[PDB]
Amino acid sequence: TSGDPLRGLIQDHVVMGVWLTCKDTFYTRDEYQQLLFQALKPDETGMYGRIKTLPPAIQRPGIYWTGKQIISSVLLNLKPSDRPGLNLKSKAKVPGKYWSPDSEEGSVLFDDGELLCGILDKSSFGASAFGLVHSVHELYGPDIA
């Protein structure tokens, strides 16, 4: 009927999205690797040999990967053979004022396939166009979306 996509995640996944991509989150190495491998689960799907990660966002006094880096990591492992990374700018559902006065999150910007600023919610991945998942459907073809 209209272009607006109909597939996409629902209640629990999207609330946990607002809570994972939020910027006060932090992971140690163990949680990062474990959560990533739970996400990917290559062997049941296949086609990929070894899982590759990012450097940590912060390095001292304790090494900590952040949440947006986990989203960027998933996007990095699902990039096709040779397609440059995703880059995109789009308003998110959680309005900017809820986080702070003149808050930065607001609107997801991410270049070359790394989630630079902004949190993912019902507008990003779900029954809302021009988000992350729809742009993956446009760039990297349907079976990757």
């Binding site: 491998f37 062997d43 296949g46």
Partner: protein
């Protein structure tokens, strides 16, 4: 068939995915914890295909120095040593 190597293993046997049969998080999480304590590992994260069946996909990737099977063996030995340390302290506590 307790432990097998899945068809995704690198030829150098450095990026390999054991699949432990009839196990759930009970050993998976503990062994992952002990394996992370090993410097020469880059990645170690377990999963479960579907809670209906009892199979645990493991995954261990390491630096080119030492292969992965040696890492799994050393990690299991370390976990056994940990269990023994706990049982020794416990037994020595009460008369």
């Amino acid at each position: 068939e307790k432990i097998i190597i899945l068809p995704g293993h690198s030829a150098d046997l450095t990026s390999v995915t054991f699949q432990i049969q009839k196990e759930d998080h009970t050993l998976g999480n503990s062994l992952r914890y002990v394996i992370m304590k090993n410097p020469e590992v880059e990645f170690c994260g377990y999963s479960i295909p579907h809670p209906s069946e009892a199979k645990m996909n493991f995954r261990i990737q390491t630096a080119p120095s030492t292969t992965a099977v040696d890492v799994l063996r050393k990690g299991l030995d370390d976990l056994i040593d940990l269990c023994d340390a706990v049982t020794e302290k416990f037994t020595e506590q009460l008369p």
